[PDB]
Write a protein that binds this ligand. Sequence first.
Ligand SMILES: Nc1ncnc2c1ncn2[C@@H]1O[C@H](CSCC[C@H](N)C(=O)O)[C@@H](O)[C@H]1O
Ligand SMILES: Nc1ncnc2c1ncn2[C@@H]1O[C@H](CSCC[C@H](N)C(=O)O)[C@@H](O)[C@H]1O
Ligand SMILES: Nc1ncnc2c1ncn2[C@@H]1O[C@H](CSCC[C@H](N)C(=O)O)[C@@H](O)[C@H]1O
Ligand SMILES: Nc1ncnc2c1ncn2[C@@H]1O[C@H](CSCC[C@H](N)C(=O)O)[C@@H](O)[C@H]1O
Ligand SMILES: Nc1ncnc2c1ncn2[C@@H]1O[C@H](CSCC[C@H](N)C(=O)O)[C@@H](O)[C@H]1O
Ligand SMILES: Nc1ncnc2c1ncn2[C@@H]1O[C@H](CSCC[C@H](N)C(=O)O)[C@@H](O)[C@H]1O
Lengths: 243, 236, 238, 236, 238, 237
Amino acid sequence: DPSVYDETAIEAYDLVSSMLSPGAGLVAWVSSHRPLDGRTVLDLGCGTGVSSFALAEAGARVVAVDASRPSLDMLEKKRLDRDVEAVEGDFRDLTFDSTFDVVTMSRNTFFLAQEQEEKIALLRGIARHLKPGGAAFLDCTDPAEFQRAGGDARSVTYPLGRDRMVTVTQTADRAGQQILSIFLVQGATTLTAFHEQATWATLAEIRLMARIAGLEVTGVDGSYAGEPYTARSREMLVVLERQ
Amino acid sequence: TAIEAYDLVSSMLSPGAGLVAWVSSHRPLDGRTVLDLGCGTGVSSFALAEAGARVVAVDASRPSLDMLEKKRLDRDVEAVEGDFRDLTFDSTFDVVTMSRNTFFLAQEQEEKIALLRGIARHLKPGGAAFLDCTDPAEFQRAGGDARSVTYPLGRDRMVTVTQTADRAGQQILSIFLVQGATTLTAFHEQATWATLAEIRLMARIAGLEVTGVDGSYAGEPYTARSREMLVVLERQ
Amino acid sequence: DETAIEAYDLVSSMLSPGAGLVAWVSSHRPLDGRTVLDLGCGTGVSSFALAEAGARVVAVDASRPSLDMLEKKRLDRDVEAVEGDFRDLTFDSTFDVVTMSRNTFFLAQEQEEKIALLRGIARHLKPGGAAFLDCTDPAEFQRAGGDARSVTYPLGRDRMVTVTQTADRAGQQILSIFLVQGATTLTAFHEQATWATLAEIRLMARIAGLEVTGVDGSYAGEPYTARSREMLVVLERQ
Amino acid sequence: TAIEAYDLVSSMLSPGAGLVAWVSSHRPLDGRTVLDLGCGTGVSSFALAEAGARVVAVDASRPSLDMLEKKRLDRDVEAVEGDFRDLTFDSTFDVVTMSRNTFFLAQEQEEKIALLRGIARHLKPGGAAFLDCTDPAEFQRAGGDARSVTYPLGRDRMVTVTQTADRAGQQILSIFLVQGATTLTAFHEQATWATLAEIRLMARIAGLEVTGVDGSYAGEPYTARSREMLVVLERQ
Amino acid sequence: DETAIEAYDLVSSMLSPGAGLVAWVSSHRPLDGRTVLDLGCGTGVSSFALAEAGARVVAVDASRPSLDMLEKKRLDRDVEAVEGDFRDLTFDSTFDVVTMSRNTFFLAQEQEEKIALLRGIARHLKPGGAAFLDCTDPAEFQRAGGDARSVTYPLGRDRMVTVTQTADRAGQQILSIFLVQGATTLTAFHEQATWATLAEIRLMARIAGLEVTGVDGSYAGEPYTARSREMLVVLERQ
Amino acid sequence: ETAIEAYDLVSSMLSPGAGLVAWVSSHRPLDGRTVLDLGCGTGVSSFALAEAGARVVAVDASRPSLDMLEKKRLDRDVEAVEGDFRDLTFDSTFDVVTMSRNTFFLAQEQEEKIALLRGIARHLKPGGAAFLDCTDPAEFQRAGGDARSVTYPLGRDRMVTVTQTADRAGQQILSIFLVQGATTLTAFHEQATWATLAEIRLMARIAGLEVTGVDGSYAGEPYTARSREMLVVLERQ
Ligand SMILES: Nc1ncnc2c1ncn2[C@@H]1O[C@H](CSCC[C@H](N)C(=O)O)[C@@H](O)[C@H]1O
Ligand SMILES: Nc1ncnc2c1ncn2[C@@H]1O[C@H](CSCC[C@H](N)C(=O)O)[C@@H](O)[C@H]1O
Ligand SMILES: Nc1ncnc2c1ncn2[C@@H]1O[C@H](CSCC[C@H](N)C(=O)O)[C@@H](O)[C@H]1O
Ligand SMILES: Nc1ncnc2c1ncn2[C@@H]1O[C@H](CSCC[C@H](N)C(=O)O)[C@@H](O)[C@H]1O
Ligand SMILES: Nc1ncnc2c1ncn2[C@@H]1O[C@H](CSCC[C@H](N)C(=O)O)[C@@H](O)[C@H]1O
Ligand SMILES: Nc1ncnc2c1ncn2[C@@H]1O[C@H](CSCC[C@H](N)C(=O)O)[C@@H](O)[C@H]1O
């Protein structure tokens, strides 16, 4: 069956994201700005729900959007009794109209709207789907981190339990602001490779994009702990609200 | 005295020839009109006029224009006092220039947008604007920690440049300490940089479009290895 | 040499003002009306800042010319200038607060000298008092493999100082050359120090009867971490 | 089997198209004779043959030539066992190629001189030799400390490359660890680099002259910012 | 664990063979017919190199599975395997030489534990004996700011190990993850250590009755300098 | 000329001859031996060699530098000779030939270094040795060749700022020297073309010499990847 290849990749992705990007940091960071217990969350690029389920475990009701039907398939299988509604859609152009208390984009998902005009269209969609007093959250690596080796290939290998491992190889083009991550997930007798390419935006770009789209950046933290964003920050956690 | 030192540093460290050679590879200058924004004491303006151009040189510093005039001799340069964040005249030009990093002296993003609006309003239909910039990645190589380099300025003068930066505010501060055998003059300039991606958006808001970027005065395309960011803009 | 002391006082006044030390110290212990022992006081930049927060300051330096400059500058500030070696303090007296301004602690060069200093600090602390070692994080000194680096700072409109630094990681030695210039003047001096990491200081403190009870990463008082560039050590009697 | 693993690594990480494009920009290949030295399993040789060249391909590894001949099909490539430090046949060619860093596998300087002498002896009057090399400054960036990068090789295979260097001996060692879900094949190559300055000297000794140097397959001039050192040599 | 110990023995045998340790020790104390206490002996990579130089070896480790492997490999070599905690040795023998192989000293984590370890070394040295701490220079652990880095090494033709390290400069903590692989096998283990600089070690040694008497920068015996990447510490009594 | 006086002060303080003398003495005796010191300048190297007992012939193309040498010479056995070390015309042989720190790089083109080395071979007695005192050129590349400045004291009343740029493809290194007192400023510059040890081996062979030793510091450590100096000992083939 052909789609087993993509299913195995989605399973690997879910394992990598579960261990290397748990939802807890996003949940801790969002909660420092807005209450989640009893509120509504629009989670854009929910994937297999690592971010979505952690938001639900904080008491939120989550509407979780992804363009990948197999990833939503895995979310529904793992959902169990969690209050997460899986929705197939393109976060560059949301068709349905509703408004939420908080909107979230997990670590670097915002950079998967590649072109600047795609980021703008995405932000217009976030504005249109935000309650007047709502706030949207862009969980991002500070893009300075992507330029540290001149964009040359670098590889780091992490354990995924004592039976699995993942090697991440990353290259970047500073002029196009492109970053490409190859993921090689291995067990004793298995190897699954998949990749993902993103176009980053700096905080200064996001201020202009937000302004174009009808949003305003109202806060930036430098870590999940809520420290303010400074030159020494390695993360760029953007809070936005309607103009 | 500080304006004199400023003029010497600019004449030696940022001569106008590269800007002229880079602008010339995109637009002819002999006989064309040029609006030179942030002309200062005129180092860029003079080099443009000497390429054939009728130049209108604009600066907000009356004392810098004073020295432009005393050094202009017979070059075709009309010095004008004005704020390039809000130009108040009605001319239209073949070519608009901003010398090395002058663009970064419109500090806030809204000020760069107001400046680029003014530039669009003063371009002829087929004109082109030129932003001579350091690639801002260069400002970030030391984490923004104070670094100093010392340059000769002839056989009798020298300048020490000490720079600090804040990457989050995109601020860069340059302190200039100009010395002779028995003189010391100090001055500083602080700028807010913007990346090419930022400039693409600012251009669009303002009514212009980036139509080319070069990586050096020689005309290499702008790549991740470029250390300069030479932006060409046209009306959309 | 007199011109050297003037140049030193100007550099310290501009690039190491006492305001930061006073703010940090005030985060942990009150100064208004308390007694402060300021060790390695120099020409008084730290000491005057401490006196201006209301402390009764006893200021100790081994450099009689520096103390002379301190006394010239002192005016009515409540600072007593004492010539002495802080590796071996001669007088008996206990204080609410003991201070060592930025990197002065590293001027007791050998580890045994640092230990002798810390014992003196312990013997001059009131039971509830605290000692404060204001230090650069010594990781900062190893940044270029100890190779010579120079940075030039303005000192107002008409003066400047170029600081050239070299370090030897194995001896934990750092050498700073200060070249102070005006239009028609040039004065050079130097200072060589031996740094100690926080881990070393914990040991030396314990040997001397002190305990490291707090470490801040900057004058603003956030905790010391791997990302800190300053190492501001609070110590108390055991 | 290490031969199979090497062929896979080279086919995907250093295909011949780059070398072919670079050589083409200096000499035509359609219908010409080409001597490909250290041809290996023929990644370079077959790209050259597909450009229309008649290729004699020399390697000292008979298992590698076995793989070449297995892969050849109808491509115009003659496989020859030989040591390019001492080529013992007499034919004369239009173009001589050595693929990425193969020139560095003649280890000692005298071996490199012997190799270049053989290249001169096998070049036709208006012919040209091509040394495709990394710029050796790239090998010193980490002080020669061990560094590892892991590359995909399609969906179900990968190679980890671990490199160490010795600046004083100009030695670079590469370990290749090729893996699939249930396989692991390891092999290594050790090389001795030479800078452009050394190559100019070795060339004159051997009877050649460096006539061009490019910094990339796209034919940019070689400069301080180049990361490749592509050398064109002609007979004296 | 059984496969974990085997993976460890392969990694140790190939990435840190005993030959270097023995050549270094032998340049300070000839070993033929001497008694050697090898602390943190593991599966005996250091212990058997020492025995092969002619020493009579007591090899101490807290891991019974590792000592079982040592005993399986021992054959005729003069090594006695003893289960014990080197922070607190309960037997009373004395030795010409005490060895701790590469970075094993850093596995006595806290400063107080290193001191107890060093006291135990002193109590177990004969008159004129010497102890040898084979360490990486901890400056190496601070490149990259403690950020995760990975390096992959072959282990023969058909096995490999990827070592991934992270560090916290303030805690002086270094964590190494070892991922050992064959064509169809994957075994992961890890070790976390607390480093100490030479300056720290001098102090701990003195607190424990010992004295740093020599420091080499490599197994070849050249002196320890700012350029050294290894810190090979020689200790003797009083 | 003030430039030469500043040159002498900078060279005397930032590059004393003592290290060269100690390194050379660890390979050949100097006491009563003959030394050809090429590119002697104002004699910082030549005088330190004479203090070790050498009978020194000191060659330089700058007549004003030689004038200052003769003026500082006083007692010492140093004969100043105006000449071009790429084309030495006198005919004498010596026990030792020296080139002080980085002077070998002032023979700019590779063919000029080869002519120099041929002259060295022609002026060495059999059994003699030649010494090229050099910075390891890797040091010139540490900043990608970007401008870097370091300021050194020159006593209490003088200083010098050295600003260096490099072009790794041309193997060019440019040093600008800004010498100051309280009331003076004198600027001058020197540009050189470096050669690596591997280049020097080949150039030596072409010229009839052989590299027989390389040290990594004046102490005589061996030359390794961690060395920051490249001290080359050469002998006739
Ligand atoms: N235009 C688009 N519209 C919707 N989803 C998109 C998209 N572009 C990318 N995605 C999705 O964005 C996801 C990014 S990975 C993050 C997944 C999840 N939030 C977690 O916490 O792990 C992928 O699932 C991808 O399919
Ligand atoms: N609105 C404005 N805001 C900031 N700087 C302005 C300005 N209008 C003019 N300037 C001038 O911008 C100049 C930057 S320096 C560049 C000067 C000149 N083009 C040269 O080639 O040297 C200063 O002279 C500053 O006074
Ligand atoms: N052993 C010692 N005993 C006393 N003072 C000493 C000393 N070693 C160094 N010092 C003094 O410590 C000072 C260091 S500079 C700090 C000066 C002052 N606290 C300020 O804030 O500027 C010098 O004045 C020096 O003379
Ligand atoms: N004398 C010699 N010394 C070293 N390697 C030699 C050699 N003669 C041939 N070679 C070969 O040089 C090759 C280097 S890699 C092979 C490159 C091949 N042209 C490709 O494009 O992939 C090896 O195959 C090696 O066996
Ligand atoms: N407190 C302690 N007491 C005894 N052994 C300890 C210990 N802490 C760690 N160890 C042991 O120290 C060893 C470190 S690895 C070094 C093993 C061996 N010397 C070799 O050459 O390979 C491990 O075997 C571990 O179990
Ligand atoms: N071709 C050449 N022939 C002779 N001297 C030369 C030369 N090229 C450069 N020089 C000289 O080489 C000298 C280099 S500076 C070193 C001077 C001296 N040995 C010392 O120890 O300070 C200069 O004096 C310069 O004039």
